[PDB]
Design a binder for this molecule. Sequence first.
Ligand SMILES: O=C(Nc1ccc(F)cc1)C1(C(=O)Nc2ccc(Oc3ccnc4c3Oc3ccccc3N4)c(F)c2)CC1
Length: 284
Amino acid sequence: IDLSALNPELVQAVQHVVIGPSSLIVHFNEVIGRGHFGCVYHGTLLDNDGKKIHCAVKSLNRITDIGEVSQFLTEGIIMKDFSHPNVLSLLGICLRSEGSPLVVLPYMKHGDLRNFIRNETHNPTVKDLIGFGLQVAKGMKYLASKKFVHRDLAARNCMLDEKFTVKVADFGLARDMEYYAKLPVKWMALESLQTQKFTTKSDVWSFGVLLWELMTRGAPPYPDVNTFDITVYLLQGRRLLQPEYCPDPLYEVMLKCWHPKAEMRPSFSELVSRISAIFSTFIG
Ligand SMILES: O=C(Nc1ccc(F)cc1)C1(C(=O)Nc2ccc(Oc3ccnc4c3Oc3ccccc3N4)c(F)c2)CC1
């Protein structure tokens, strides 16, 4: 890539988080995923002391479009100041002489939250699942305090580390590793379906859908609804049904997250408080 063609403010931000190429070993034989625009590999990052850090290494497939390259780097820069236990962090960006720049993330042992709760070999309790939702709410409370609007909050975009800590994330250009200007319409607030604008209050709607994903252990929402009909479906006066093991107060929280008026949906601060209380009523 020719750095001189990129936005100078973007390049300066990248240099503040740069990883030297010799400190990063990309295991091209160990692929985490491949999509149309990017791919992700296992990697080993060496710090100044020689300690090996297991990481995921995200790459573009092509480097010929300045728009794709700029967007790919911007995704990494957007993350750079996220410092919270429930938000995925950025290890850095490796600029190489040849090939794609590399976005380097701490490796998440248990992958994405949706596949984790769908895996019949794991047995999270109701309390565990509510705990996962509480952790997401805490990450979103942090992001909302930075005035950051996520725009694609969903279980598929949350990661789980080796301690089962949930990290809010966004696969971004690697999201295709559903969407139908490809939009996750079944997670979108009614006003966003109509205007395609997003706010923290539309993230709250998406969070309510994520809670429903948790309480169903990863069922697809609105499975019998055509993607282009979801607005009509909702406007008939409908919401996702209460899952069988979802406690009544948590379903009430979901219904508040789906309030027809964005301004009346609870803040993520309120959601953390309310879900903390519900969580605490469970022994296990
Ligand atoms: O997250 C982002 N931005 C952002 C936005 C909002 C926010 F609040 C926080 C963050 C970005 C990004 O690229 N995110 C991203 C996420 C997850 C990835 O995949 C990983 C990452 C680590 N280890 C796992 C690997 O996937 C797996 C799959 C299966 C089994 C195991 C793993 N392991 C990835 F490569 C990249 C866009 C910059």
